[PDB]
Design a protein around this ligand. Structure first.
Ligand SMILES: *[C@@H]1O[C@H](CO)[C@@H](O[C@@H]2O[C@H](CO)[C@@H](O)[C@H](O)[C@H]2NC(C)=O)[C@H](O)[C@H]1NC(C)=O
Ligand code: NAG
Ligand code: NAG
Ligand code: NAG
Ligand code: CL
Ligand code: CL
Ligand code: CL
Lengths: 148, 167, 149, 206, 167, 167
């Protein structure tokens, strides 16, 4: 079958931007569209947008219209997703999924394993209590985690 | 084109059909519009992506290939080494340029055949319930509302149903 | 958006049905797909074009669409079928996009020297302040934590 | 800045091809500076041809041995290759212009040198003649190299004129390397494809 | 296919037509059966055998070509000799694979054109004495017994004779 | 031919049409004659001259390339040099012969398509004001004097004007 492999996890501050990638096996040119779908903890998936082979045209969901940019390097069999003006609400698992044909559609039949993007006002810090990215713990209003 | 359709009896292209390579423009009392033909655009995108991948796979990457040094008493093998390096470059340049020239011609003819195949499919569907008015258009003898038009584009037009309803 | 019931439950061997209700802009004028999602894993397609299954999806999964409502059906319910189920379709509302349902969960039956001081109150073996949500132990008793800064 | 003392470099083109498949080496002193040579004049062999900020110096890896109070004992030192990798070894041969300077620096009348392995075997008879001056020295130094296969031993037997080696090289091969000639500078960039005009960042086939 | 016949408006093939590549299936009151079209199958077998012979003749046989030995002081010409041997193998491998890829595409299109040529020949014969019912079949307006069917397959159908005998 | 026209439904050629590659032969009460079709002959001459120039430009001229001399102790590099020279000649001979074989096939099919395109253009013009009598001829249902014939060959035939004047 086809393997979709997203790039590593990302941890970014609000207002910055992140560019994740999705590398597809075979090809390297594909005859099917690829879109990105995310899913926040305790939430349903939400489509973000997709890209069409050969034509290169893109469609974006209204919610991310204006701050998401999907691009493709067909010779490298890779598709990119850049999301800017990051809010804390953008913290979710991001998947690339392929469609059965060349048009983006409600039917995505094969998905990647997903990668996480965390958006917090915090920076990395060593524990003393008060440490940041996870190595059950709870998070204070500081954005810092404190465990026991 | 070898099939007489593109830049042929269909005089030109449609900047307003954005969702595909070949398709329809309809016109009835409810309105007008474009619509790509998914099934045939898909088959072509299959083949062209396959064509491009084929070109890629046949040109395996060049690994480390550096020059060599020769003394003032080794000019025969120096020139031989130069002859070899230049020769192979002349041959891969010929191979690359020729493949792209020939594949480009076939790609264009391919698209031309795909348009002609689509036109004849519709013609075979509508039979004599519509008038072939050239330029690739069929003028219906019966009222063809949106459901009627939608069925033509699905390939399930109902020639018996409308043969009794001609104007 | 598409509305589904938040949660449905049944005993093994039974048949359940998950309804997905939209409007004339989504379900009433476009195809409907269904996805199954297990914890830690990506959504898995179960049904496409209203009622067709991909390769590998068993006979007991099925879907249908009536006017504005779609419906997933599962029979011979198994323990492994306890997951989240989502409908999706192509909404022509404002700018066209892919829209998922809300989801339906199927259940089967020293420091005080730094001018700071924090409290510690743990809790487990059950069944300004932050609070730990009740996680799941290997014991299968609920556990958590809480702190007052 | 290659050979400052004039002479012919024997099989220098072939040596360059051997190194284009070399990713790294192990540099050790095959014959320690002081430990290997007990009764031989070591630190008296600099020259003006190879300078170093006014003063005279010499190659850092070969050593120019001369007479120790009008005495130069015959050398018979050897090295067995207990390294696991092939050992690159270089040395030189000095041809003074005047027969007086032969006994001035080596104390012996008509000297001889022998180097030996399995892929090499040769003897040298120093030629004395009035050669033109290059860097101020009318004499010539002719440089040599040989690869010592693992487990074999090399042998140097001489009575003067032999420019002994101090440091040798145990080589690790990696086909996929080479030597390029470029005037372009080096940067802290990282690429996967390099040409002498610059690095290429692409997925295209040509 | 570029000509829309094979896997086109003729939806599939006939395992029951064993004596050739293209032909007919008829159906009248006396019975039914298959029959290859000899003249067109022959022309294709001419060209394909010619094509295969052409590939053969262009790849002259390799005669004795052995390697060479070099010393530890001859690695530049050793590597040059290796460069030459590898280079030519990469080029004949490219030539061989590319020729077969391109000829395979042309061979399939060739068969597709041959089927379309045959269908249009019959269509031109029967004219409006029969109804084009798609899928490559003609439904006769007159009784077409075995002699009638045999004459269609010989190319000597008698359009005037049967134009007066329509049902 | 792949398009069924040349040596196809048009059984043969015209030694009496001297001013071009494709054209017309007409026959009415005033007289008969041939006339080349300028616009389509021109398009083909464009492409074929382009094809021939393309072949030329891809075979850059060979500059001075002389042999070399070797001693009785240099036979390995002598044979290597011979291997290189022979190898490249075998490859350019293959390239040259193959290109001409493939381009010759495409050139003939090209002409075949051009004739078929012309025939269908006229057919699309005359519609049912004339009877398709095979062999590439149209038999008119109305009197078609020289002006009428001239307008067919200009592509500006007046199907409404003559649809009322049928015999
Ligand atoms: C390094 O190379 C430089 C340049 O070739 C050498 O310096 C030259 O030596 C000649 C000797 O007659 C002079 O005429 C030139 O004027 C010098 N050039 C410069 C720029 O100084 C130098 O000797 C070499 N050094 C070593 C240690 O070999
Ligand atoms: C469109 O065609 C398919 C067959 O290819 C058929 O199954 C389907 O019902 C058709 N759709 C409509 C609306 O008629
Ligand atoms: C078949 O066709 C040939 C001409 O191609 C003709 O001579 C022959 O008489 C025909 N056979 C029959 C039985 O009509
Ligand atoms: C021939 O056709 C052109 C259009 O292509 C037209 O302008 C011209 O008037 C026509 N000539 C005659 C005599 O009708
Ligand atoms: Cl074209
Ligand atoms: Cl085919
Ligand atoms: Cl022909």
């Amino acid at each position: 079958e086809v393997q979709l492999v997203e790039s590593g996890a990302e941890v970014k501050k609000p207002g910055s931007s992140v560019k994740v990638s999705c590398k597809a096996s075979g090809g390297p040119f594909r005859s099917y569209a690829i879109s990105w779908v995310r899913q926040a903890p305790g939430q349903g998936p939400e489509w973000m947008g997709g890209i069409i082979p050969i034509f290169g045209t893109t469609k974006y969901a209204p919610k991310f219209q204006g701050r998401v940019t999907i691009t493709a390097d067909d010779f490298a069999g890779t598709v990119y997703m850049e999301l800017s003006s990051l809010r804390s609400e953008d913290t979710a698992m991001y998947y690339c999924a392929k469609h059965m044909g060349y048009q983006v559609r409600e039917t995505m039949d094969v998905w990647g394993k997903g990668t996480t993007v965390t958006v917090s006002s915090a920076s990395t810090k060593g524990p003393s209590k008060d440490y940041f990215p996870e190595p059950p713990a709870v998070l204070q209003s500081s954005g810092l985690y404190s465990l026991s | 084109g070898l099939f007489g359709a593109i830049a042929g009896f269909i005089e030109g292209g449609w900047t307003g059909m954005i969702d595909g390579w070949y398709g329809y423009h309809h016109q009835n009392e409810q309105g007008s519009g474009y619509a790509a033909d998914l099934k045939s655009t898909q088959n072509a995108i299959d083949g062209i992506t396959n064509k491009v991948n084929s070109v890629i796979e046949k040109m395996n990457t060049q690994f480390t290939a550096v020059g060599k040094e020769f003394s003032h008493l080794e000019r025969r093998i120096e020139n031989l080494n130069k002859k070899v390096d230049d020769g192979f470059i002349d041959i891969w340049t010929y191979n690359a340029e020729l493949l792209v020239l020939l594949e480009n011609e076939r790609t264009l003819d391919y698209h031309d055949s795909n348009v002609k195949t689509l036109y004849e499919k519709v013609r075979s569907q509508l039979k004599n319930n519509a008038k072939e008015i050239g330029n690739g258009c069929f003028e219906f003898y019966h009222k063809c509302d949106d459901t009627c038009m939608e069925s033509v584009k699905n390939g399930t037009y109902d020639y018996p149903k409308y043969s009794e309803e001609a104007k | 958006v598409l509305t589904q019931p938040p949660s449905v439950s049944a005993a093994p061997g039974q048949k359940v049905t998950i309804s997905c209700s939209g409007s004339s802009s989504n379900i009433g004028n476009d195809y409907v797909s269904w996805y199954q999602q297990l914890p830690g894993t990506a959504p898995k397609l179960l049904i496409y074009d209203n009622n067709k299954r991909p390769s590998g999806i068993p006979d007991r999964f099925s879907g249908s669409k009536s006017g504005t409502s779609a419906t997933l059906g599962i029979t011979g319910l198994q323990t492994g079928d306890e997951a989240n189920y989502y409908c999706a379709t192509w909404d022509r509302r404002p700018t066209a996009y892919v829209v998922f349902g809300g989801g339906t969960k199927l259940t089967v039956l020293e420091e005080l020297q730094a001018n700071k001081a924090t409290l510690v109150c743990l809790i487990s073996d059950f069944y300004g302040v932050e609070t730990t949500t009740p996680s799941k132990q290997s014991n299968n008793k609920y556990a958590a934590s809480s702190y007052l800064s | 800045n290659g050979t400052c003392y004039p002479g012919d470099f024997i099989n220098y083109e072939e040596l360059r091809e051997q190194l284009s498949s070399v990713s790294s080496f192990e540099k050790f002193e095959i014959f320690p500076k002081t430990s290997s040579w007990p009764n031989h004049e070591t630190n008296k062999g600099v020259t003006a041809a190879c300078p170093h900020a006014g003063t005279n110096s010499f190659y850092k890896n070969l050593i120019w041995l001369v007479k120790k109070e009008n005495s130069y004992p015959k050398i018979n030192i050897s090295y067995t290759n207990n390294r696991g990798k092939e050992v690159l070894v270089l040395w030189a041969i000095h041809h003074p212009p005047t027969s007086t300077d032969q006994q001035s620096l080596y104390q012996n009348a008509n000297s001889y040198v022998f180097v030996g392995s399995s892929r090499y075997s040769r003897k040298f008879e120093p030629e004395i003649a009035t050669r033109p001056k290059v860097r101020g020295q009318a004499g010539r130094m002719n440089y040599y190299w040989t690869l010592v296969e693992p487990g074999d031993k090399i042998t140097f037997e001489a009575t003067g004129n032999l420019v002994v080696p101090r440091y040798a090289f145990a080589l690790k091969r990696n086909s996929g390397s080479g030597i390029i000639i470029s005037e372009t500078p080096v940067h802290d960039c990282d690429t996967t494809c390099q040409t002498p005009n610059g690095a290429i960042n692409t997925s295209l086939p040509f």
